Symmetry: D2
Subunit: 307 residues, 4 copies
């Protein structure tokens, strides 16, 4: 029986081997509370702590399972998918319903979560998210509904596998480079570059973007309209901010599809970076990491076409 | 034949479409000519006033418009148009010069819809990719796909095949002539901005708006309308002083619900239901022309 | 508190289970009682009582269960505030649309089921059950036709279908969307069906003892016409074709159906494609062959309407008007 | 430029050969074209399938890649057949139109440009047979028609597309895992007919006649479009259990459009000799069953086949 480590970052999602005695029939389960906060307050600090831990105790066990809140689970998963160097399955799991309500999704999610982490096939596929009998990759997965237990879907490329009765039928694996193939190492960092997001919409104010420049942010991510477009005010503010070193990334408020390279905006003339299929939140995770390597817009783009 | 007035706000989306002479006597006039990413309050008031002013001179209106903020203009017109004739919007996701451009057939179908007597009393309508969609619920789901506009929470109202519409639904929230919103006497609208939530979110953006005396702030929260700590503080205090705060969500479907995760009564906050951040901004604005009391905005937010 | 009656048709979707035959009235009654006890919270929103009308897996649903359910609901209308019917998920969408068409009662009738065994981890039964009761007890659910409540969403009997084989979120209205969503015991209703249902249809099954025979044939590359010929040779009143694309037919299937239609069999062209309408005279010249186009109705659902239409008329044009009204 | 062979199977999907209808075609490849057949896809059949496979596997060495024009109705069926039987390693891309070529906003022209664009990409190879529709690249195993009239109807409903196409460039982030093309034991080059496989539908009060008729005419295999996770109406179950006994191959699939029919979940497969088709819908599963029947009539082995391709 495999040894599996459950790393908690918050409250319990089930009720732990007491809560779900079935866990004992699939693996040797050990657990440790790494931190305790709501996911809406997730930060650089916790992020760095988790990747560090995973990298540290990586040889001490056969796989990890991370309980996390759902609010920003898509952010954390992507950051780990980029920064973890361990070659053992790292699986994230949460619950849409409180462990004390009727029909709590937590226990079964957990069990499937463990099952996934403990399957030899689950290795080498990146940081994984297991929700609603589905295995999802940390890159494409995202929360598509506010309350539904089925909210987590890889909206662009789809799931990796499905789980029935503790058996998984994998029929896909991600192509973009992840984990041990990324040049990203935070083992040595204590803080990450400052990157923020601004939203576009009709009559968009420039203050938010201006306020970010004046605080000297390293990076700004634009959640544009349509295929990455920006409202006049935001555009001007960002283009000058792209000439004073601030790395500017064009992404989109639209939940599926890519923000293509020089199509709607002449990225070249201004030095903007197109996020591709990464939503504002994810594009932010990648800008942050790239800004610990280079500061060259032409080099950040190449990063966005690879990871 | 019916008389149809096309109101253009941008470049063409077709080319024209000779088949249109088969369904209506079509008239048109440019109103503005901008990409929709720079759409603003001015164009809005202008479109509404015109619609309400020429309302009797036509059998129905068709508005050509860019796809980026269509869902925003649609809802505003949905709340402010007092005309009882069909108002329908169309765009094209492909340039008219392109192979397999969608604009031409989209426009045809748009006119078909405005010319159908059954299209009345349904609110402002968006017609794309052979589907009729209501102003409130429609949003852009994909950056480039021709089938991008979907009513992701409650579904479409009708589908069009060979020029006829199978209508099986009608929006229940109040719209057009049933709203207390009159923008005729207006030349300006309350200032409402939007801030995004995410891990480590900065409170600067939220701070800047407050410092500029914005009338209202819409939060695009994480999950069911939750806020990152810093943002939460800034916004809680801001509400104490008289700023209208609306919790909406960055998550594309599902409602941001009243008092589930955040204690709305305690902090003077408003929950937007199924309105996304950008649509939530539209109703908050108009709401601000009526009241400023949180419980009254909340009730407006439950009605329209 | 409202009085809600639960009519069960199969296994228990919440709790531990009996293993009882439940053919005995008294025992069936005790079986629905154990449900209330399995979901204590049900006591805070309604006085719940009930009985076991039948007990079969839903793969074995049949005309007889339907005539019974319909008659029962129509008969007990006065005695209660609303109905909640527990049903297996396999053919839930068929039963819902039959009731949607034959129920004359004006109180809410709501169907509910579960994709997970009630003894399973994270069983969905209990909460579906609770939310069905909430829906049945809400005065705003009145007049919306028969309803299916699953996974916090209120659905209408006409458009609802099962989209996935095992997902708890499988029930969706794939063409027109849901009617309302339930958060914390409250329903956000923003739509209501526009097609006539329940008391506004002319279908009365109250004196009926059996229904016209209607079967379904599938189309695919190289399809055989034997299945179609079998239903005709047995004298079926009607045949529904699950066609390819916009209701098209494979060559051999067309030939058989053309003759069937000319000699008394009612023929409805539907589609195996899970969303969108099979439209009149688009891909097939319906008027020349005497065929009916099903609209957004899928094969199973179109079967349900063709049966009812055949109690009224056997004329294709009249039947076609019916597929356009219900 | 690559030499791309457009094989057409019906009317033209562009034009109000196709090279003059889509001038842009010439910027990206050398187009040669033959009309292999001219039927509407609702009449697609075993003979055309046998013909198409042999063709591609014949002229494999003579070109850089294939673009097959096909009606939408059974596209998803041919796609899978050719996915189990093509032996070429060059890209074989399928494509069609949901709107008539003479139509306003016809989709055929751009669809075609993109199929050619797809067949010419060095990346598009070793991914199985492909179906390119509406700016998307889909494998022939999961792709299926989702709506009766929507130009966007083709989706791989269980696993997602292989890539997206913008301005002539493909962003591939997925390749199909199941074995396809050259890695399959399935060889049709010496065949003239395929085993006889039919489909029966399940629903409330379902008749057993359709099933009985296939059995009595001695079909080799039958595919059940079941309810839920492949379950069967009583009467149909019965007829089917005996059929297996009489040596008929029986595969449980589902009328439900997504998700998998699981083995020994709702029906005791071992007890009756049934095979559960997994994520294969009833018409995709007939294709695999026919092929598998050209190697074995053993249930346990057919199953295993449904678990590999």
């Amino acid at each position: 029986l495999p040894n599996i480590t459950i790393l908690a970052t918050g409250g319990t999602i089930a009720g732990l081997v007491n809560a779900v005695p079935q866990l004992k029939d699939i693996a040797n389960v050990k657990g440790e509370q790494v931190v305790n906060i709501g996911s809406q307050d997730m930060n650089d600090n916790v992020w760095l702590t988790l990747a560090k831990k995973i990298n540290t105790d990586c040889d001490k066990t056969d796989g990890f399972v991370i309980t996390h809140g759902t609010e920003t689970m898509e952010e954390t998963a992507y950051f780990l998918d980029l920064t973890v160097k361990c070659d053992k399955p790292v699986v994230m799991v949460g619950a849409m319903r409180p462990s004390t309500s009727m029909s709590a999704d937590g226990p079964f999610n957990l069990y499937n979560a463990v099952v996934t982490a403990a399957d030899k096939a689950s290795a080498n596929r990146g940081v994984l998210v297991v929700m609603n009998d589905t295995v999802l990759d940390g890159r494409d997965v995202t929360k598509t509904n506010t309350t539904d237990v089925a909210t987590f879907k890889s909206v662009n490329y789809g799931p990796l596998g499905y789980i029935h009765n503790g058996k998984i039928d994998y029929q896909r694996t991600p192509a973009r480079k992840h984990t041990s193939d990324t040049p990203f190492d935070v083992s040595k960092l204590n803080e990450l570059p400052k990157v923020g997001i601004v939203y576009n919409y009709a009559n968009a104010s420039d203050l938010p973007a201006k306020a970010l420049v004046d605080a000297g942010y390293d990076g700004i991510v634009s959640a544009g309209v349509g295929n990455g477009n920006l409202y006049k005010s935001v555009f001007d503010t960002l283009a000058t901010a792209a000439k004073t070193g601030t790395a500017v990334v064009r992404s989109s408020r639209v939940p599926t599809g890519a923000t293509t390279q020089d199509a709607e905006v002449d990225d070249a003339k201004y030095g903007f970076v197109a996020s591709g299929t990464l939503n504002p939140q994810k594009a932010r995770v990648l800008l942050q990491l790239a800004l610990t390597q280079t500061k060259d817009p032409q080099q950040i783009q190449q990063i966005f076409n690879q990871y």
